């Protein structure tokens, strides 16, 4: 079935979301063993000790400290995209529509998942969100590439799950 055929609501609702994830049932033995081991770690209490050790190390931060940090970065920082970061977004936005146009012209059926200007503003928001982590007033090209990778990992592979958006 199509991604729009699986959902019990209108396909235009999907366009209003910036990033859509399609979570899969892998049905693999080695992944099931690992996830079962992880859940048993949580239930036993080894996960609590490991998380405390990593919080002492610093690879994991505390939840209250993250909450206060999120508040601080929300009030302090509001990044701006650089002019050299704009032409790459304008290219990576128009290539998706170039693929979508020829796919929809060949199929003569409209894709159930659309790509619109709201998705461009979504990638802009992701880019200026990655720079807000660093307390960086300027969004650089290195944030743009991560934003494109995040958009590929969420919206574009879900679009490729649509046979019309693929081909």
């Amino acid at each position: 079935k199509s991604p729009g055929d699986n959902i019990d609501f209108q396909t235009t609702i999907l366009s209003r979301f910036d990033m859509i994830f399609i979570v899969k049932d892998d049905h693999n033995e080695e992944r099931d063993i690992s996830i079962a081991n992880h859940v048993i770690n949580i239930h036993t209490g080894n996960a609590n000790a490991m998380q405390n050790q990593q919080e002492e190390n610093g690879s994991e931060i505390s939840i209250e400290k993250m909450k206060r940090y999120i508040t601080y970065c929300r009030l302090k920082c509001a990044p701006r995209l650089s002019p050299q970061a704009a032409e790459k977004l304008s290219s990576n936005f128009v290539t998706i529509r170039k693929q979508l146009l020829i796919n929809e012209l060949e199929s003569t059926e409209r894709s159930s998942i659309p790509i619109t200007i709201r998705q461009l503003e979504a990638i802009i928001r992701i880019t200026e969100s990655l720079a807000k982590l660093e307390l960086s007033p300027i969004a650089q090209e290195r944030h743009v590439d991560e934003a494109i990778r995040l958009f590929q990992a969420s919206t574009m592979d879900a679009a490729s799950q649509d046979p019309i958006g693929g081909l």
């Binding site: 302090k76 920082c77 701006r80 529509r97 409209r110 659309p114 200007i117 007033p137």
Partner: protein
């Protein structure tokens, strides 16, 4: 005679002599009143005797008197009112009611809300902004009763005062209504020689956007006197300036023995209706001479229609014909009222339908922000009684009264309806009467009323498949009934067809739009949001007072001026064009998005009149008719 009172009177004399604007304002009121009196004597309106006083000017002149006005208004406002009365009596001797005072300017810690009003602010001058929820019946209050004794043939009188009339407390001497004279002769009341001052009480609750989202709201009663009566309706956003007073005894007397506390209210001196977003108060701007000259020098140009249109929402790429339609709707045509009571529409209705993410909701939000009286509604969120009217019961009289819906509240205004397709059929057939007859008829249990609903309507709809299809029938695409389709003056289908050059240009425009910084803002700092409350009186970033494309504050000065000033009249040269185009559209072989009826002819007349309003022309010309005709062709083909 109190010495410190006289010293304060003399100090306010010095302040009034220093600032000559108030001296000119008193004289200007007096000449208006005397000219109207002389007109009534030879062959109308009267101005009240009160003066707007700036608190900042008083602070600069005398900080002690300014702090006295704010902190102890009972000891400082009556001397200043006495001083103003002395000045007005000294100037009005050549050509009787004592003069009053109003206050404007910054209040500092005295700029409060009904939640923020506390008992430390009692006996202080406070400025309180909120929403009017309840208003009382306007009631006359007897001030002086005049009586006639027929036995002696003489007229007697008695004066009455209450605690709300004076800022300072007085010994309460309750003098009864006299029915005897001092000798025992019967008195008859002389109605019409007695004086009655209008009195009102309103309730000001804190604004629902400035109130916490879960808590019950806090409110306060405001008492208004003769000239401040009926300056508000329920639902208005208001700023009331007045003295936060305590009255009576809070149960300390033996007869009273209860913990209502001391009853507290604001003795209002000043009421400012405020314009907020999607409210019933219309936004108005005071036009200076320089702005009028700017509007008139833009009016003589030839590209003024293509300059105001592109300057509506320059942050939206394309939709150039929709911007023109929104501008002509904001002009709004001319309403005709014939001699037999028959009414003809003047305002323009626009429906937009098409693909998602095509800036339809952004255009709706722009019209909500740029129009004087725009109200925003949603499809299923509003109901039949939500838009038109409802019937409730008030506490005092117990009789049924009306609560005005969004359409009635937007009389002579703008209704922005989002998600037009998802609306219920009862509310649809309610909207059929509003969009053509421009009235709302309520026939409920006991009540039968007709309300004015003279409105412009902008609607945003979506096709039933979610995306517009070229090969399918547009009647199948929209799937809206014929009668609603005929009501809308202009219907715009906006498809999200994608081309490489167009996607490139829109991508560059949106990316360069997201790289904007407001003036005075640092690079990393976030822009703060301040809610816009404006006082109602009576893609390039750098647009600064009509260089190429006008600013939004100037554009609504132009629209306001064109609406109040020019009333264009149709002429034969436009009539021939609209008749020929209407006949051609009626007999066209082409398929159209919108059906063709006699409503399209009146749409052509309204659009020609609206274009004439843009040019500030008192006459409708051929060039107006042709642009009104080929604007309609785009919405049809």
């Amino acid at each position: 005679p109190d010495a410190v009172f006289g010293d304060r009177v003399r100090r306010f004399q010095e302040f009034l002599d220093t600032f000559t604007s108030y001296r000119d304002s008193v004289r200007s009121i007096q000449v208006y009143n005397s000219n109207n009196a002389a007109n009534y004597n030879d062959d109308l309106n009267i101005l009240p005797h009160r003066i707007i006083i700036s608190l900042d000017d008083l602070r600069e002149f005398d900080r002690s008197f300014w702090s006295g006005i704010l902190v102890e208004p009972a000891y400082f406002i009556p001397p200043a009112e006495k001083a103003l009365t002395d000045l007005a009596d000294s100037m009005d001797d050549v050509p009787r009611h004592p003069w009053k005072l109003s206050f404007k300017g910054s209040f500092g810690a005295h700029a409060l809300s009904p939640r923020t009003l506390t008992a430390q602010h009692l006996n202080k001058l406070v400025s309180v902004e909120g929403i009017v929820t309840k208003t009382s019946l306007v009631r006359p209050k007897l001030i002086r009763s005049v009586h006639y004794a027929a036995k002696t043939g003489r007229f007697h009188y008695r004066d009455y005062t209450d605690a709300t009339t004076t800022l300072t407390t007085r010994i309460p001497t309750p003098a009864i209504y006299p029915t005897e004279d001092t000798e025992g002769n019967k008195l008859t009341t002389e109605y019409g020689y007695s004086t009655f001052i209008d009195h009102q009480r309103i309730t000001v609750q804190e604004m629902p956007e400035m109130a916490p989202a879960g808590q019950l709201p806090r409110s306060i009663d405001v008492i208004l006197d003769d000239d401040l009566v009926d300056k508000t309706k329920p639902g208005d956003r208001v700023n009331v300036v007045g003295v936060f007073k305590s009255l009576g005894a809070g149960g300390m007397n033996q007869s009273n023995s209860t913990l209502i506390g001391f009853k507290t209210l604001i003795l209002g001196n000043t009421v400012y209706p405020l314009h907020a977003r999607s409210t019933g108060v219309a936004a108005r701007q005071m036009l200076t001479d320089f702005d009028i000259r700017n509007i008139n020098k833009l009016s003589k140009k030839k590209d003024i229609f293509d300059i105001l249109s592109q300057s509506l929402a320059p942050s939206i790429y394309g939709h150039d014909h929709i911007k023109k339609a929104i501008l002509l709707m904001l002009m709004g045509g001319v309403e005709k009222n014939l001699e037999n009571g028959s009414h003809l529409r003047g305002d323009i209705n626009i429906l937009m339908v098409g693909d998602p993410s095509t800036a339809k909701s952004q255009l709706l939000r722009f019209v909500l922000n740029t129009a004087s009286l725009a109200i925003a509604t949603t499809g299923r969120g509003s109901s039949g009684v939500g838009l038109t009217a409802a019937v409730t019961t008030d506490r005092e009289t117990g009789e049924r009264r009306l609560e005005a819906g969004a359409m009635v509240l937007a009389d002579r205004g703008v209704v922005c309806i989002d998600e037009f397709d998802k609306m219920t059929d009862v509310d649809r057939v309610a909207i059929h009467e509003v969009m053509e007859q421009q009235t709302v008829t309520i026939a409920k249990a006991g009540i039968h009323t007709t309300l004015n609903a003279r409105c412009s309507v902008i609607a945003a709809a979506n096709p039933v498949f979610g995306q517009y299809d070229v090969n399918r029938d547009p009647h199948q695409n929209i799937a809206l009934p014929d009668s609603l389709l005929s009501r809308f003056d202009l219907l715009f289908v906006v498809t999200d067809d994608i081309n490489e050059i167009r996607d490139r240009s829109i991508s560059e425009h949106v990316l360069r739009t997201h790289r904007y910084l407001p003036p005075g803002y640092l690079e990393g700092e976030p822009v703060r949001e301040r809610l816009n409350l404006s006082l109602a009186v009576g893609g390039n970033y750098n647009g600064t007072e009509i260089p190429k494309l006008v600013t939004i504050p100037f554009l609504r000065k132009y629209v306001q001026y064109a609406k109040e000033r020019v009333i264009p009249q149709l002429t034969q040269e436009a009539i021939n064009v609209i008749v020929k185009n209407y006949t051609d559209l009626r007999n066209d072989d082409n398929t159209k998005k919108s059906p063709i009826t006699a409503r399209t002819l009146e749409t052509l007349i309204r659009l020609a009149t609206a274009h004439a309003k843009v040019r500030l022309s008192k006459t409708v010309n051929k060039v107006d008719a042709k642009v009104a005709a080929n604007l309609l062709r785009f919405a049809l083909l």
